[PDB]
Amino acid sequence: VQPDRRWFGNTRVISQDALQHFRSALGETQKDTYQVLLRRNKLPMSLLEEKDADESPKARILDTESYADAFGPKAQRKRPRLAASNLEDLVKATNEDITKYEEKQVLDATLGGNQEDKENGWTSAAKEAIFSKGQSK
Amino acid sequence: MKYIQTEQQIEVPEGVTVSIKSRIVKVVGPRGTLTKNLKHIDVTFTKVNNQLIKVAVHNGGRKHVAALRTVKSLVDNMITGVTKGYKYKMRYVYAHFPINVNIVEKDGAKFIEVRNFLGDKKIRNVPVRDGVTIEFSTNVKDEIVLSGNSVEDVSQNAADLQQICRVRNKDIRKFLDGIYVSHKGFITEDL
Amino acid sequence: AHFKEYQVIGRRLPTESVPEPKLFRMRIFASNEVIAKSRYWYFLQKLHKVKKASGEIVSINQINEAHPTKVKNFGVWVRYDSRSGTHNMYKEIRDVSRVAAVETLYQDMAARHRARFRSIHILKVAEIEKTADVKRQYVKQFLTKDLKFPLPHRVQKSTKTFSYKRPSTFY
Amino acid sequence: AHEQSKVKDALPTYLLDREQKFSVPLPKVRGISEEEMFKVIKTGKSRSKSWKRMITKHTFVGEGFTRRPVKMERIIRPSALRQKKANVTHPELGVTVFLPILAVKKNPQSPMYTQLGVLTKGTIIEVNVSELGMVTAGGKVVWGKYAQVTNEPDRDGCVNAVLLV
Amino acid sequence: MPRSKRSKLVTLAQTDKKGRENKERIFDEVREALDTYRYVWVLHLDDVRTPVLQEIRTSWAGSKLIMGKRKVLQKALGEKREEEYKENLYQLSKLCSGVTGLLFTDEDVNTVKEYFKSYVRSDYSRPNTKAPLTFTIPEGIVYSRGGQIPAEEDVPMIHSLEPTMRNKFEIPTKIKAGKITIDSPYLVCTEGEKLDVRQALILKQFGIAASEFKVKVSAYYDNDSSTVESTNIN
Amino acid sequence: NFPYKAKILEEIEAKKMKDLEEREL
RNA sequence: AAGCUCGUAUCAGUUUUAUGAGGUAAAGCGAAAACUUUAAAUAUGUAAGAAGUCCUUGUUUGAACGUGGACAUUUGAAUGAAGAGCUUUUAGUGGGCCAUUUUUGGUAAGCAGAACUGGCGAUGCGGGAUGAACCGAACGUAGAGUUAAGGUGCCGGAAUACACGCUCAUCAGACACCACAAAAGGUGUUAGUUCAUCUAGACAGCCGGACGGUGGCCAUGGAAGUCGGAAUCCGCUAAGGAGUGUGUAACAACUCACCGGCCGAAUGAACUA
RNA sequence: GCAGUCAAGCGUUCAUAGCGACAUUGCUUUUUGAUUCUUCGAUGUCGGCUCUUCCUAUCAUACCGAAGCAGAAUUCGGUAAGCGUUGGAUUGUUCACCCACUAAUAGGGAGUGAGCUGGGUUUAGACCGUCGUGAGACAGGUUAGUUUUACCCUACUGAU
């Protein structure tokens, strides 16, 4: 590989106006099903994307408390986070979560058989291999 | 470094006299007589003055010289056994099923019988060796005592007794039942 | 062979405007006079720049032991160019002559180091005059007073094939 | 550490209390024969026609590919050996990133294997760099750096590379 | 041994061995004291508690008390007739036996011969030394002091020390719930009898200081007079 | 580990005492 | 081979002498390693007398070519030996394997293409249990003697020789070796090397001390040296960590690290073989 | 694997000429068990009935050891090859899968191309596709298609 001033140098590059031009066109375009794509244009896409969510990811608890301190013999965790406000709000926050559970059993009864066959003490039959076909590698 | 000659001293109290032809060894004294064969061991025995006997290795390597020291120890034990005697106390703790220990003699053969260990129908039998005597202690609970002139006989017999009552497939921490050597000492004493 | 100690002097060559160079004496241990001369040149090249063609032996002479009746304690210094980098060694040998001590050394060194005559280089043999300069333990063993010991289980050298006695190792 | 404990760059506030010639770095790589790399594929009921060749070494193919008809094809680059993204690293900094490949520009051992796009060891490739965030003086911001591949991606599936900085 | 040896028990504590440089410091001190302070004593104290020694040493700040090795202090005073710092000074050093215990001062004799006669403190009985006491342990549940109190004061013993009681202190025990029990009353000791090593440790364990410590001293030296005196006090 | 060590320093000193002087004068 | 046109003091897989070259650097000192002179074989080339030397002075003072004269064998280093080239010509053969030594390019690891010298092919025989290339070895037929390499418990000719050491392998080793699995793991044994400690008593044991500010600060249901986080200081000392571990819900008690008494002389640690 | 980081050591002697073990950081795609329906060119033959034996790198049975091992059941490890290791469905293919029994359905070697076969060797017939101006051949695909020993020596099994 013959040494050269080419390489180390930057090949492609993009204009800071042209990013501002291309970021808008995500907002504009508009697909049309009678149209169809032949070529794409080489574009640095990771810059142009990232659009505005309104929610954020969850916080990283592992950094603050490891695991060994979260539970163990080592275990530096006397009180819960965040924990409840008041014992009115706790007892409010139980009684709906009881009835929400009591719902799901009455629902998943009517979805069902599967347990009652196990109590009766018998299994459902083998699914036939033809119903695969196909599928297959 | 191959030492040219090395020696030990065996000291004899007045109660006992000890007699050696070849490497056969006899000790005689008040409690009784013990005999031991050391022909394998390959050392020289010399008498200087009744109260002291010297054993030596000539031109011995390191392994050989190690054996020389144990010979002193083996001969001393016979001397302590013949005058002082050896006494072993065993105690047999049980949670829920009382362990019944009796001596029964079958055809003169003298056996220790353990019954109902951890609620087992099986009877375990251990034979008492020659020159060891088994008694159960007055004014103590759960004590069995093994006493005889020979150290190896008493100790080996006591170890057999505990191994016979080993627990199997139950966690040691939860189940504490068995027989153990509470104390090792001399018959005599008071010392 | 069985060894012989040798004085070896050798003086370089004379050249124009260099009359009488210094002479250089060594005490070589070797089998014969031929090997002692070849030994002498091998030592001399390490110490300074010389060769066999550039110089000459003056006077090879044997050195016999002064008192080969009397039992002496020797203490030989050795080094040897192996394996790996070189290192020194000090063994003490109890022997009657110097040449016998160096014989018993080379057999001891050939066992323990897998190393030849050409490898090993003797620095200096020294008689030890007074005892309790003897630092080693196995030589200090035999210097104790009124020394007695038995023969070491006496093995019997068998002359015959068949023997009628049932041989007693005696003792 | 007992013996050590017995005896006795600069960043801002918001960055501390944290943690993390023109020689190419591989000139002269081992030469590859043309008979290795190109496995022969024979065709017919009597397997008796040869002519098809399969590139066994790894390949960057394109953005835009499509195979060609089986009768017209010859130089087969199979789809398991078609890398899209390489694993580029920086001599400065000390951070790798998994970056998409944009082209293959210089391939040692002949101008064939550039044109098929065969990655090998030694090959120099256009990398999309936008996760690193390099900016030329001029203020333009950069997304095309040449990088040299450091390993033999036959012998393990990952294509590693070093940026030519 | 080339090989097959005892490996020594390595562990990583803070404090390190003193060696020679500390042993010099005492030799330097003792020879510095003798010229300064006028009267010299040598106290046998074969056992002491440290907070007894702190009470002895605080009760006169100016008057010096230097402990250390016998074979330092023999060397510092002088073993032989020739090698010694002052005259007739070996004569005191020959007599000593147990744990010295060496004192310098600039003070009156009739204070000091009174002081260590009048001084006495409570302490443990210790091995090889008869003590005027006797304890049978009460024969249900054992308690921490072990029948030197009304039991409803004292807490029961900690199960963790029952393996020590079984093995080392020998006394036959078993435990019922947490609490340590014996069926029949075990005697430890009797009055006018020499104590075996373990019979002390039982009295230490239950914590019975019922034997008098008092320091004692034979010899006495004076720098200006340059002569030794030996006096019998216990 | 040697008996007669402290000679040989004085031998090397006394041998070098020549090689200091006899080069110069 | 058929030959005959030389059998001349000429030839040589060689050394030495003189001179040339890589100038590696080891001598060596400069005038303040930078010199710039010079030395040992390591290796490749040239040269070392019969038309050979010198005097005289022609051709176009010197230089290259010459005219005419006088000068023989220690005749121009060593050692070897006579077998070199012709003119015609005419049989067979024209790619290949192994190792060694230089050298250029090389990685999973082999190795690749050049140069030379050996060995085999056409070649038996002794040894390596057996074997294209390994150790020895000048093939007519016999006899005697002495050896090579290799061997000497028995098979098997020849010491169950002599001497000094080392090694025990619950399937040692008797070796391909100047490698590979290889770098290390072992409370297996022996010999070394370099530091320490020690009759101001070491190493190992037991016995005694191991304390005061203090239950140091925050932490918390409770943490008193020992669930944790930050510091880790002062005092009295012979010595005693704001504590090495076991242990209590917390303390307690035991332990060590460090002093000390008893005992009495050598011992410890890390490396090399 | 690539690029580093610490450093017990090698490098003739040697800290900082270059190497360098054991540790260790970088992503190969979201930290809340969501799905993640990703199946992406094996250009070479194996697969199965019958029957024997061997290895251990142990799936089950035997005896041990260690785990918050209370039992009960299980996991991990040690010695161990004495003795077992199955029944079926599936070729729009099965280099696999599933469900059922079971103490358990461990992994291999010598296989059983002359003991017998099914795919593939594999020729003559034929059709469809692709390519070729064509004869034809192949990116294919589909269908039809005679090799038949022992009486010899040995081995093995029984018999004089």
JSON list of C-alpha atoms (C1' of nucleotides) in Angstrom, two decimals, chain G residues 73-132:
[
{"chain": "G", "resi": 73, "resn": "U", "atom": "C1'", "xyz": [70.70, -23.67, -13.81]},
{"chain": "G", "resi": 74, "resn": "U", "atom": "C1'", "xyz": [69.04, -22.63, -5.72]},
{"chain": "G", "resi": 75, "resn": "U", "atom": "C1'", "xyz": [66.70, -20.60, -12.94]},
{"chain": "G", "resi": 76, "resn": "G", "atom": "C1'", "xyz": [64.16, -17.35, -9.22]},
{"chain": "G", "resi": 77, "resn": "A", "atom": "C1'", "xyz": [57.96, -19.58, -3.20]},
{"chain": "G", "resi": 78, "resn": "A", "atom": "C1'", "xyz": [55.85, -24.52, -0.89]},
{"chain": "G", "resi": 79, "resn": "U", "atom": "C1'", "xyz": [53.69, -29.65, -1.77]},
{"chain": "G", "resi": 80, "resn": "G", "atom": "C1'", "xyz": [52.18, -32.98, -5.51]},
{"chain": "G", "resi": 81, "resn": "A", "atom": "C1'", "xyz": [52.26, -35.67, -10.05]},
{"chain": "G", "resi": 82, "resn": "A", "atom": "C1'", "xyz": [53.73, -36.49, -16.31]},
{"chain": "G", "resi": 83, "resn": "G", "atom": "C1'", "xyz": [47.60, -38.84, -18.51]},
{"chain": "G", "resi": 84, "resn": "A", "atom": "C1'", "xyz": [47.07, -31.52, -21.42]},
{"chain": "G", "resi": 85, "resn": "G", "atom": "C1'", "xyz": [44.90, -29.71, -25.90]},
{"chain": "G", "resi": 86, "resn": "C", "atom": "C1'", "xyz": [44.02, -31.12, -31.33]},
{"chain": "G", "resi": 87, "resn": "U", "atom": "C1'", "xyz": [41.69, -32.38, -36.79]},
{"chain": "G", "resi": 88, "resn": "U", "atom": "C1'", "xyz": [38.09, -35.79, -38.15]},
{"chain": "G", "resi": 89, "resn": "U", "atom": "C1'", "xyz": [33.79, -38.87, -35.22]},
{"chain": "G", "resi": 90, "resn": "U", "atom": "C1'", "xyz": [30.31, -41.43, -32.56]},
{"chain": "G", "resi": 91, "resn": "A", "atom": "C1'", "xyz": [27.57, -44.43, -28.66]},
{"chain": "G", "resi": 92, "resn": "G", "atom": "C1'", "xyz": [24.25, -43.20, -24.79]},
{"chain": "G", "resi": 93, "resn": "U", "atom": "C1'", "xyz": [22.03, -39.20, -22.10]},
{"chain": "G", "resi": 94, "resn": "G", "atom": "C1'", "xyz": [19.02, -33.25, -21.47]},
{"chain": "G", "resi": 95, "resn": "G", "atom": "C1'", "xyz": [15.35, -32.02, -15.63]},
{"chain": "G", "resi": 96, "resn": "G", "atom": "C1'", "xyz": [14.71, -34.50, -10.04]},
{"chain": "G", "resi": 97, "resn": "C", "atom": "C1'", "xyz": [14.94, -36.16, -4.64]},
{"chain": "G", "resi": 98, "resn": "C", "atom": "C1'", "xyz": [17.28, -35.36, 0.14]},
{"chain": "G", "resi": 99, "resn": "A", "atom": "C1'", "xyz": [20.48, -32.73, 3.58]},
{"chain": "G", "resi": 100, "resn": "U", "atom": "C1'", "xyz": [24.46, -28.66, 4.51]},
{"chain": "G", "resi": 101, "resn": "U", "atom": "C1'", "xyz": [26.34, -23.54, 4.02]},
{"chain": "G", "resi": 102, "resn": "U", "atom": "C1'", "xyz": [25.72, -18.42, 2.27]},
{"chain": "G", "resi": 103, "resn": "U", "atom": "C1'", "xyz": [21.39, -14.87, 1.03]},
{"chain": "G", "resi": 104, "resn": "U", "atom": "C1'", "xyz": [16.60, -12.41, -0.43]},
{"chain": "G", "resi": 105, "resn": "G", "atom": "C1'", "xyz": [11.38, -12.30, 0.56]},
{"chain": "G", "resi": 106, "resn": "G", "atom": "C1'", "xyz": [7.94, -14.53, 4.29]},
{"chain": "G", "resi": 107, "resn": "U", "atom": "C1'", "xyz": [3.12, -16.20, 8.71]},
{"chain": "G", "resi": 108, "resn": "A", "atom": "C1'", "xyz": [-1.60, -19.55, 12.42]},
{"chain": "G", "resi": 109, "resn": "A", "atom": "C1'", "xyz": [2.20, -23.00, 10.97]},
{"chain": "G", "resi": 110, "resn": "G", "atom": "C1'", "xyz": [4.68, -24.74, 7.41]},
{"chain": "G", "resi": 111, "resn": "C", "atom": "C1'", "xyz": [7.76, -22.22, 3.82]},
{"chain": "G", "resi": 112, "resn": "A", "atom": "C1'", "xyz": [8.88, -19.80, -1.30]},
{"chain": "G", "resi": 113, "resn": "G", "atom": "C1'", "xyz": [12.50, -18.62, -5.67]},
{"chain": "G", "resi": 114, "resn": "A", "atom": "C1'", "xyz": [17.81, -17.92, -6.49]},
{"chain": "G", "resi": 115, "resn": "A", "atom": "C1'", "xyz": [24.07, -19.72, -5.43]},
{"chain": "G", "resi": 116, "resn": "C", "atom": "C1'", "xyz": [27.51, -23.33, -4.15]},
{"chain": "G", "resi": 117, "resn": "U", "atom": "C1'", "xyz": [29.25, -28.07, -1.97]},
{"chain": "G", "resi": 118, "resn": "G", "atom": "C1'", "xyz": [27.97, -33.03, -0.51]},
{"chain": "G", "resi": 119, "resn": "G", "atom": "C1'", "xyz": [24.77, -37.80, -0.70]},
{"chain": "G", "resi": 120, "resn": "C", "atom": "C1'", "xyz": [21.48, -41.24, -3.98]},
{"chain": "G", "resi": 121, "resn": "G", "atom": "C1'", "xyz": [20.60, -42.64, -9.08]},
{"chain": "G", "resi": 122, "resn": "A", "atom": "C1'", "xyz": [24.82, -47.28, -11.88]},
{"chain": "G", "resi": 123, "resn": "U", "atom": "C1'", "xyz": [26.79, -49.37, -5.05]},
{"chain": "G", "resi": 124, "resn": "G", "atom": "C1'", "xyz": [27.41, -54.46, -2.25]},
{"chain": "G", "resi": 125, "resn": "C", "atom": "C1'", "xyz": [29.39, -54.71, 3.10]},
{"chain": "G", "resi": 126, "resn": "G", "atom": "C1'", "xyz": [29.58, -53.38, 9.26]},
{"chain": "G", "resi": 127, "resn": "G", "atom": "C1'", "xyz": [26.13, -50.89, 12.99]},
{"chain": "G", "resi": 128, "resn": "G", "atom": "C1'", "xyz": [21.13, -47.95, 14.09]},
{"chain": "G", "resi": 129, "resn": "A", "atom": "C1'", "xyz": [15.52, -54.57, 16.57]},
{"chain": "G", "resi": 130, "resn": "U", "atom": "C1'", "xyz": [13.40, -53.25, 11.20]},
{"chain": "G", "resi": 131, "resn": "G", "atom": "C1'", "xyz": [14.22, -48.84, 6.98]},
{"chain": "G", "resi": 132, "resn": "A", "atom": "C1'", "xyz": [16.44, -44.63, -0.51]}
]
